[PDB]
């Protein structure tokens, strides 16, 4: 499933369940991916992301894995399993502690995890929320934390 499919499925689940959480797993900065492409070739970079995909699929078999960008994957956690958010993040962090090996070369991926709880009450499914979870994934990497939750100010005093 691609980016559009994720947006569509999120819209459908929100209307039906009222809430859900999206997790964005950013394997590496686009710039670093580009360094890999120039240094080892584009085919190598594709194999690397395919290997990353297989590892996530192996760790979370009961989860539908979406492809957001060339370096990002998305997971949709239904309202019923939002209580598993942190556990999923911890499992992904543990899974990527070891280098991803492709074509005999190990590549250490420092996965950035963005966490975005969405609510139907504010029509989140109709909004372009992708940018928010992606920014959160970058924020997790910048802060060096396990995962970063979308946490905007709730009022002017907090803004």
From Swiss-Prot:
Disruption phenotype: Deletion of the gene affects both virulence factors and the quorum-sensing system, and significantly decreases total bacteria in a mouse pneumonia model compared to the wild-type strain. It comes from the Bacteria. Residues 18-153 form the GGDEF domain. Transmembrane segments: none annotated. Induction: Expression is significantly repressed by azithromycin in a time- and dose-dependent manner. Expression is also affected by clarithromycin or erythromycin, but not by josamycin or oleandmycin. The EAL domain contains a functional active site loop (loop 6), which plays crucial roles in stabilizing the overall protein structure and participating in catalysis, and also controls c-di-GMP and Mg(2+) ion binding. Phosphodiesterase (PDE) that catalyzes the hydrolysis of cyclic diguanylate (c-di-GMP) to 5'-pGpG. This is Cyclic di-GMP phosphodiesterase PA2567. It comes from Pseudomonas aeruginosa (strain ATCC 15692 / DSM 22644 / CIP 104116 / JCM 14847 / LMG 12228 / 1C / PRS 101 / PAO1). The lineage of its organism: Bacteria, Pseudomonadati, Pseudomonadota, Gammaproteobacteria, Pseudomonadales. The chain holds residues 175 to 333 of 587 of the full protein.
């Amino acid at each position: 499933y691609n980016r559009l499919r994720l947006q569509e499925d999120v819209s459908l689940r929100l209307q039906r369940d009222g809430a859900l959480t999206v997790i964005a797993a950013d394997l590496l900065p686009l710039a670093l991916l580009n360094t890999i492409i120039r240094t080892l070739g584009y085919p190598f970079s594709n194999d690397l992301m395919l290997e990353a995909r297989d590892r996530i699929r192996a760790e979370l078999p009961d989860f539908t894995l979406y492809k957001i960008s060339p370096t990002r994957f998305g997971l949709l956690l239904p309202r019923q399993q939002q209580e598993e958010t942190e556990s999923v993040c911890l499992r992904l962090l543990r899974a990527f502690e070891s280098p991803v090996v492709c074509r005999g070369i190990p590549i250490k991926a420092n996965v950035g995890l963005g966490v975005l709880p969405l609510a139907d009450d504010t029509l989140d499914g109709d909004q372009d929320w992708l940018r928010l979870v992606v920014s959160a994934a970058d924020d997790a990497r910048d802060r060096g934390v396990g995962w970063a939750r979308y946490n905007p100010p709730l009022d002017q005093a907090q803004q």
